[PDB]
Ligand binder design. Structure first.
Ligand SMILES: Cc1cn([C@H]2C[C@H](O)[C@@H](COP(=O)(O)OP(=O)(O)O[C@H]3O[C@H](C)[C@@H](O)[C@H](N)[C@H]3O)O2)c(=O)[nH]c1=O
Ligand SMILES: Cc1cn([C@H]2C[C@H](O)[C@@H](COP(=O)(O)OP(=O)(O)O[C@H]3O[C@H](C)[C@@H](O)[C@H](N)[C@H]3O)O2)c(=O)[nH]c1=O
Ligand SMILES: Nc1ncnc2c1ncn2[C@@H]1O[C@H](CSCC[C@H](N)C(=O)O)[C@@H](O)[C@H]1O
Ligand SMILES: Nc1ncnc2c1ncn2[C@@H]1O[C@H](CSCC[C@H](N)C(=O)O)[C@@H](O)[C@H]1O
Lengths: 241, 241
């Protein structure tokens, strides 16, 4: 079933990622510091595929003006409630045009893997370049590479919130040039009983040199740092190559 | 869903109840001690609704001859493999006839709740009495009574065993004079990927006087003891009444 971050799946996103130990406060701090390394004076940040706008809520404490772009209306609805004073655009990272430039353009937690093929990767990175200030920095957190992805990987966790128990379990396979991650949820609580939910995605296993080539074609210089927020590293790009 | 202890549900049974902390070793030892209290020289035991035969496997070390009865073929299959040298019958606790009598007749973990109302309860207790020796004892672990059931109860647990992860979540409500328990599972492993299973059962909340009535109509004296292996207590009955 779903591949579009919507309905109950969208409502469950923050809770399950908090449950899994994702620390958006620490990630934002680190992002902020990294942005300031490359661009001492940095003042504004666009978060592209900002999802439920968690990083944006914390980055607003480091940057004077933040903005987001998100494809999923249901994710976007959450992020707007969380960030009621920022402008958050409903739109596609492949094609957007905001009429303005930012000190940082960020794209976090491997949202970039929802792109297929070099053409789409090149297009996004070109849009990212089209929205970054001449002394700013673009930051893209890749998906795993084909060489380091671990097929067969199972994640399972349970979290409780407000009397509701939520169990999420994922299985990931190598399905050609993408990971297939299939994720099932069981939600249960005394009054609502039990419901079952599912999502399934192809997340593209772009090689390191594929991302590098996307940055380059977009006029950015590209550097890679191993590790990073989720283990997959981080690319940063500076205009002027 | 399913109400019939079959297929992968039967295959997951031992694993999920082990994960919940069910200790058939201790339960069997306590049961043997209780049988010996009422029938010091008890030597044989029929476990009715023996399921996958866990109690029977431990009760073998206490009684010279153990035997089982079980309605679900798939549960029975597993119990026979576990208890290769005992006779395990395929049939129905409401209407069975094995041609012999045992020092103890047991019916454990609220399998009695799978009967629909007083007439079926009466008939099973009369079959229990027909298969007990004159100086033996019938043991029935009841379902919850209506006064001690908690509607809205949620159980949720995840266990991993041999490459596989298994999450089981249950939710219970009051439906007439029974509990509706709905149980969802997620099973995931590296090679097999992820599947969702479900069962639903209607387990009758017979009152204490209902059970007592059934023992008495079967010719058995009855005593209830609170607590028990599962918190639901334990009835024992002795022929001769
Ligand atoms: C720990 C580890 C994981 N993996 C892969 C296995 C699997 O595809 C993924 C972790 O699965 P998960 O924890 O269920 O996924 P995660 O929370 O990272 O979320 C990922 O998938 C969801 C669907 C997207 O919305 C999200 N943006 C992705 O990060 O990373 C590896 O390749 N190597 C690893 O060491
Ligand atoms: C601990 C406790 C449990 N309950 C009821 C709530 C729910 O109906 C049940 C526990 O749910 P569970 O732990 O998922 O069920 P359990 O492992 O005991 O298994 C029960 O249901 C399954 C379907 C049967 O095969 C089994 N023979 C039954 O014991 O017992 C209560 O009413 N009060 C309680 O304090
Ligand atoms: N073409 C596209 N344009 C914009 N957003 C996209 C997209 N394809 C997928 N997405 C969004 O990518 C995000 C993946 S989840 C990551 C969410 C957020 N960046 C965080 O760190 O939590 C989802 O919100 C999804 O809706
Ligand atoms: N009418 C009937 N006759 C015999 N067994 C029955 C039955 N109705 C349900 N059952 C069985 O009762 C069992 C409930 S689960 C309990 C199994 C076992 N006594 C244990 O302690 O683990 C299941 O095996 C189910 O198949």
């Amino acid at each position: 079933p779903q591949a579009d971050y919507s309905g109950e799946i969208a409502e469950l996103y923050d809770l399950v990622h908090q449950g899994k130990g994702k620390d958006y406060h620490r990630e934002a701090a680190d992002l902020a510091a990294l942005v300031r390394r490359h661009s001492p004076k940095a003042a504004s940040l666009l978060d592209v595929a900002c999802g439920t706008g968690m990083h944006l809520r914390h980055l607003a404490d480091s940057f004077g003006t933040v903005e987001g772009l998100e494809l999923s209306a249901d994710m976007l609805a959450i992020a707007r409630r969380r960030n009621p004073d920022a402008v958050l655009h409903h739109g596609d990272m492949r094609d957007f045009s905001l009429g303005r430039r930012f000190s940082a353009v960020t794209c976090m937690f491997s949202s970039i893997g929802h792109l297929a093929g070099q053409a789409e990767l090149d297009a996004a990175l070109e849009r990212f370049a089209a929205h970054v200030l001449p002394d700013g920095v673009v930051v893209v957190e890749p998906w795993w590479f084909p060489e380091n992805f671990t097929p067969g990987y199972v994640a399972a966790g349970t979290v409780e919130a407000g009397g509701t128990t939520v169990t999420r379990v994922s299985h990931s396979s190598r399905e050609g040039e993408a990971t297939r991650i299939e994720v099932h949820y069981l939600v249960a609580g005394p009054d609502r009983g039990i419901t079952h939910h599912e999502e399934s995605h192809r997340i593209t296993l772009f090689t390191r040199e594929q991302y590098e080539r996307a940055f380059t074609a977009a006029g950015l210089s590209v550097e890679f740092m191993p590790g990073g927020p989720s283990g997959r590293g981080l690319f940063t790009g500076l205009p002027g190559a």
